[PDB]
Ligand binder design. Structure first.
Ligand SMILES: OC[C@H]1O[C@@H](O[C@H]2[C@H](O)[C@@H](O)[C@H](O[C@H]3[C@H](O)[C@@H](O)[C@H](O[C@H]4[C@H](O)[C@@H](O)[C@H](O[C@H]5[C@H](O)[C@@H](O)[C@H](O)O[C@@H]5CO)O[C@@H]4CO)O[C@@H]3CO)O[C@@H]2CO)[C@H](O)[C@@H](O)[C@@H]1O
Ligand SMILES: *[C@@H]1O[C@H](CO)[C@@H](O[C@@H]2O[C@H](CO)[C@@H](O[C@@H]3O[C@H](CO)[C@@H](O)[C@H](O)[C@@H]3O)[C@H](O)[C@H]2NC(C)=O)[C@H](O)[C@H]1NC(C)=O
Ligand SMILES: OC[C@H]1O[C@@H](O[C@H]2[C@H](O)[C@@H](O)[C@H](O[C@H]3[C@H](O)[C@@H](O)[C@H](O)O[C@@H]3CO)O[C@@H]2CO)[C@H](O)[C@@H](O)[C@@H]1O
Ligand SMILES: *[C@@H]1O[C@H](CO)[C@@H](O[C@@H]2O[C@H](CO)[C@@H](O)[C@H](O)[C@H]2NC(C)=O)[C@H](O)[C@H]1NC(C)=O
Length: 436
């Protein structure tokens, strides 16, 4: 994709902190950028769309390469079109703005380069307000093994780069992306039946993903997802696997992950409105990525979670699922959880924590997003899933929402002013970001 000139691009600023020890932190002046899929794509020599609704225009896009040469990604009116604002260390993502639904943003080191985090033997903390996230919505904060430059050094026909939010990948090997590896996704494009703005092409973009936070006011989950190749790679067709291929398990990435959602793990009292972590008010989420020998070069061995609300430091609750002990993600936990729930252990198949840690070694980009779910209505996060199962069977119930909830047309109409706000990001050594 070319860099368009019709709408100006300016990245909202966002501060965050690096800490060396508890109470000893310094401020980084970051910024965020909107993902390429949200942008106008048009003729590089004019203003005619290359893509409208969910249709490519063959005049500009007779094939993937020509399309990328002929078409430009343009700038974003962050507040007015996309409902994205920032102030100091706070980033607020509104749900519906006009016809736009949510957003996906990346943290920048500079105007052409994503910030890279090396998570091994480190701790990441942030504050969040999920109070205005009802059933069916997901405010996500997570890491993916994207290239820092958005692909530009590898793919000459990508001139837009990180400045325009190119290069996304995740453990679903998403095929909905309009540009992957300097090519458009026109040649095998199939418009979505239920989303007027989207489709699925032959190309997908795979990489490992550490889902630190997927949540609404009902439920949350923390979920690593390994891939066979840790960093960004292209896949083709149904061999991509992931949510939108014929078979989610056909590819090189684990689409399910090894998840810890306290409600799903048998403690419904812990997280939600008025609960131990009371989602009607903001709180702090701390996540630690521990290694087997406690050093920067050890193998990822344990992912731990603490919450802070009203100055009370509260560990993740223990699992109350038979056979599955503790409050953290480890190989033992993941093996046990898949067995107890009767779920396929695709996590182990794609290298588990060892491959997650390999991705962490490559460096990962911070993503903050807000979305609703055309495939599964977020039922996997906040309801009973699958819907044919007995909600009393361990693993089925993940939150309080009914199985009719979360249909995009319903929640976009009923809760347009929903939002998620992330703030006070802190990163550093274990125990450096909070009062252990
Ligand atoms: O007026 C300006 C300009 O508009 C152009 O039209 C734009 C329009 O402005 C945008 O609102 C619209 O944005 C949608 C994108 O087309 C669409 O691809 C994107 O799809 C999302 C999907 O809705 C969402 O569920 C999905 O969520 C992912 C999360 O982000 C991740 O965190 C999680 O891990 O995984 C989930 C599921 O995959 O992400 C996809 C994107 O990958 O939704 C956008 C918001 O509604 O784009 C239009 C262009 O297509 C118009 O063309 C111009 O003429 C005009 O100037
Ligand atoms: C759901 O999860 C919550 C949070 O983990 C559980 O509450 C916690 O239960 C533990 C074990 O009983 C409590 O720990 C104990 O505290 C007492 C008194 O301070 C101390 O004597 C013991 O040595 C132990 O440390 C803990 O206080 C409590 N945490 C909170 C924040 O309330 C709860 O039991 C779980 N509910 C269900 C139904 O499983
Ligand atoms: O964000 C990427 C896509 O996510 C899809 O949600 C999936 C979750 O990311 C994944 O962790 C969850 O895995 C389930 C699994 O499907 C189920 O069989 C097992 O019992 O529990 C796992 C943990 O909840 O799967 C869901 C659904 O595929 C979104 O549906 C999709 O829109 C989005 O692009
Ligand atoms: C981070 O702080 C925690 C909590 O103070 C430390 O964990 C404690 O470690 C001691 C042994 O060194 C144990 O007796 C306690 O039971 C632990 N508490 C908890 C909550 O786990 C931990 O060692 C610190 N990490 C580092 C790298 O210093």
């Amino acid at each position: 994709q070319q860099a368009g000139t019709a709408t100006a691009e300016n990245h909202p600023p966002l501060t965050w902190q690096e800490c060396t020890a508890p109470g000893s932190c310094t401020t980084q002046n970051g910024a965020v950028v909107l993902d390429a899929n949200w942008r106008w794509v048009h003729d590089v020599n004019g203003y005619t769309n290359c893509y409208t609704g969910n249709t490519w225009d063959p005049t500009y896009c007779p094939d993937d390469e020509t399309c990328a040469q002929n078409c430009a990604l343009d700038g974003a009116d962050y507040e007015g079109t996309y409902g994205v604002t920032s102030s100091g260390s706070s980033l607020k993502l509104n749900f519906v703005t006009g016809s736009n639904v949510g957003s996906r943003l990346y943290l920048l080191q500079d105007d052409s380069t994503y910030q890279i985090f090396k998570l091994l033997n480190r701790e990441f903390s942030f504050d969040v307000d999920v109070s205005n996230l009802p059933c069916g919505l997901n405010g996500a904060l997570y890491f993916v093994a994207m290239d820092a430059d958005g692909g530009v050094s590898k793919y000459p026909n990508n001139k837009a780069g990180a400045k325009y939010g190119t290069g996304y990948c995740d453990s679903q090997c998403p095929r909905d992306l309009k540009f992957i590896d300097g090519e458009a996704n026109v040649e095998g494009w199939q418009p979505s039946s239920n989303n007027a703005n989207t489709g699925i092409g032959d190309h997908g973009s795979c990489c490992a993903e550490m889902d630190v936070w997927e949540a609404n006011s009902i439920s949350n989950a923390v979920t690593p997802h390994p891939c066979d190749t840790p960093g960004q790679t292209m896949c083709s067709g149904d061999d991509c696997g992931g949510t939108y291929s014929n078979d989610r398990y056909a590819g090189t990435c684990d689409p399910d992950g090894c998840d810890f959602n306290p409600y799903r793990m048998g403690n419904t009292s812990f997280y939600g409105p008025g609960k131990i972590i009371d989602t009607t008010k903001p709180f702090t989420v701390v996540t630690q990525f521990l290694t087997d020998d406690g050093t920067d070069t050890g193998t990822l061995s344990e992912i731990k979670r603490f919450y802070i609300q009203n100055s009370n430091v509260i560990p993740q609750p223990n699992s109350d699922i038979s056979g599955v002990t503790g409050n953290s993600i480890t190989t033992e936990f993941c093996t046990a959880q898949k067995q107890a729930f009767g779920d396929t252990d695709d996590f182990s198949q794609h290298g588990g924590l060892a491959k997650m840690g390999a991705a962490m070694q490559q460096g990962m980009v911070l993503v903050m997003s807000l979305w609703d779910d055309y495939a599964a209505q977020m039922l996997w996060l906040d309801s009973d899933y699958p819907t044919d199962a007995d909600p009393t069977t361990p693993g089925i119930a993940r939150g309080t929402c009914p199985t009719d909830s979360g249909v995009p047309s319903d929640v976009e109409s009923q809760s347009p002013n929903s939002y998620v706000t992330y703030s006070n990001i802190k990163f550093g050594p274990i125990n450096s970001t909070f009062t252990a």
